[PDB]
Design an enzyme around this catalytic site. Structure first.
Site, short mmCIF file in Angstrom:
data_model
loop_
_atom_site.label_atom_id
_atom_site.label_comp_id
_atom_site.label_asym_id
_atom_site.label_seq_id
_atom_site.Cartn_x
_atom_site.Cartn_y
_atom_site.Cartn_z
CE1 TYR A 149 7.11 0.84 8.28
CE2 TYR A 149 6.56 -1.33 7.34
CZ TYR A 149 6.59 -0.18 7.70
OH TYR A 149 5.35 -0.06 7.68
CG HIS A 187 3.28 3.62 9.60
ND1 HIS A 187 2.07 3.09 9.17
CD2 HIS A 187 4.33 3.21 9.45
CE1 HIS A 187 1.99 1.48 8.61
NE2 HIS A 187 3.88 1.44 8.36
CD1 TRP A 245 7.11 10.75 -0.66
CD2 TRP A 245 6.27 11.07 1.99
NE1 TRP A 245 5.98 9.60 -0.57
CE2 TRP A 245 5.74 9.80 1.05
CE3 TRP A 245 5.30 10.64 2.74
CZ2 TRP A 245 4.91 8.44 1.30
CZ3 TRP A 245 4.57 9.94 3.77
CH2 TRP A 245 4.77 8.82 2.49
CG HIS A 297 10.51 9.03 2.28
ND1 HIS A 297 9.14 8.88 1.85
CD2 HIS A 297 10.27 10.45 2.90
CE1 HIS A 297 8.86 9.28 2.84
NE2 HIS A 297 9.35 10.12 3.39
CE1 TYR A 304 0.08 -4.39 2.86
CE2 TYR A 304 1.96 -4.47 3.89
CZ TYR A 304 0.81 -3.59 3.47
OH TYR A 304 0.99 -2.30 2.68
O1 LIG Z 1 2.82 1.93 5.64
C1 LIG Z 1 2.92 1.53 4.76
N1 LIG Z 1 4.05 2.13 3.22
C2 LIG Z 1 4.19 2.88 3.08
C3 LIG Z 1 5.01 2.94 2.02
C4 LIG Z 1 5.66 3.46 1.37
C5 LIG Z 1 6.39 4.61 -0.02
C6 LIG Z 1 7.25 5.25 -0.75
C7 LIG Z 1 6.98 6.22 0.27
O2 LIG Z 1 7.88 7.22 0.45
C8 LIG Z 1 7.35 5.90 1.71
C9 LIG Z 1 6.45 5.13 2.15
N2 LIG Z 1 5.03 1.80 0.95
C10 LIG Z 1 3.77 0.35 1.31
C11 LIG Z 1 3.94 -0.23 0.57
C12 LIG Z 1 2.88 -0.05 -0.96
C13 LIG Z 1 3.16 0.77 -1.75
C14 LIG Z 1 2.40 1.02 -2.54
C15 LIG Z 1 0.94 0.46 -3.26
C16 LIG Z 1 0.63 -0.70 -2.28
C17 LIG Z 1 1.87 -0.89 -1.03
C18 LIG Z 1 3.33 0.64 2.71
N3 LIG Z 1 2.17 -0.04 3.48
C19 LIG Z 1 2.39 0.05 4.88
O3 LIG Z 1 3.02 -1.16 6.05
C20 LIG Z 1 1.05 -0.51 4.67
C21 LIG Z 1 -0.13 0.15 5.64
C22 LIG Z 1 -0.50 1.84 6.06
C23 LIG Z 1 -1.19 2.29 8.20
C24 LIG Z 1 -1.15 1.07 8.33
O4 LIG Z 1 -1.59 1.50 9.43
C25 LIG Z 1 -0.10 -0.48 8.03
C26 LIG Z 1 0.61 -1.24 7.25
#
Ligand SMILES: O=C1N2C=C(c3ccc(O)cc3)N=C(Cc3ccccc3)C2=N[C@]1(O)Cc1ccc(O)cc1
Ligand SMILES: [Cl-]
Length: 194
Positions: A189, A174, A91, A21, A137
């Site tokens: 990732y 995820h 979180w 994180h 993406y």
């Molecule tokens: O999981 C995902 N993310 C997690 C974090 C993130 C951010 C902060 C943290 O402490 C930990 C993780 N940041 C981004 C990128 C992002 C950030 C802010 C706004 C838009 C996109 C991001 N994109 C995701 O792949 C998009 C997604 C979600 C579910 C799916 O099934 C497929 C794709």
């Protein structure tokens, strides 16, 4: 009916989870002053990502609602700067809430955010994302710009019979990656995120 005890798999005090994180926090902290806001996160989601993916106005709106809900789940609200310690604490609360919904088989906020992202790439309505769509993406969101890391994501996951990825699989990955530090999720990732 009867009660059954389920183990909420969390390891919040493990450096590997903390660093995962911290890496993302720094990634969102563009100017490096140690603070981010929900405003910046939403701008990234709507004005940056959705705009470049040419998502429809409605898809952008739905996606924004999911992003707002997700990060508000971390305690972030519009107009308030957030430093890492608070972000991490948020979180812990999000992960705990999500894992309980998960155990009760109720849709999670990560699944719903996923639905919104997959919807943007759902050209034929089959609800799947191809490797090329994920690469787009990864590059636009900046979370995984490396093509090799994007291929690592698909190699890591269990794909459908056509070699594409569906939301059900990505949600499970995820959850293990962001909430539980599940060994089954390590490498999701590639080398893009620890
Ligand atoms: O999981 C995902 N993310 C997690 C974090 C993130 C951010 C902060 C943290 O402490 C930990 C993780 N940041 C981004 C990128 C992002 C950030 C802010 C706004 C838009 C996109 C991001 N994109 C995701 O792949 C998009 C997604 C979600 C579910 C799916 O099934 C497929 C794709
Ligand atoms: Cl799900």
């Amino acid at each position: 009916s009867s009660k059954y005890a389920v183990k909420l798999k969390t390891d919040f005090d493990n450096p590997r989870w903390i660093k995962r994180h911290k890496h993302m926090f720094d990634f969102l902290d563009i100017n490096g002053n140690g603070k981010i806001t929900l405003d910046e996160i939403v701008s990234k989601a709507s004005d940056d990502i959705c705009a470049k993916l040419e998502a429809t106005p409605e898809q952008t709106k739905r996606h924004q609602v999911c992003v707002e809900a997700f990060f508000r789940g971390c305690g972030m609200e519009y107009g308030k700067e957030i430093a890492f310690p608070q972000f991490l604490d948020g979180w812990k609360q999000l992960a705990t809430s999500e894992l309980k919904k998960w155990a009760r088989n109720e849709p999670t906020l990560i699944r719903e955010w996923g639905d919104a992202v997959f919807d943007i790439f759902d050209k034929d309505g089959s609800g799947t994302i191809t490797l090329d769509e994920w690469k787009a993406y990864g590059k636009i969101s900046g979370i995984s710009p490396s093509q090799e890391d994007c291929e690592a994501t698909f190699r890591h996951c269990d794909l459908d019979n056509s070699g594409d990825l569906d939301v059900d699989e990505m949600t499970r990955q995820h959850l293990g990656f962001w909430y539980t530090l599940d060994p089954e999720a390590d490498g999701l990732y590639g080398n893009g995120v620890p």
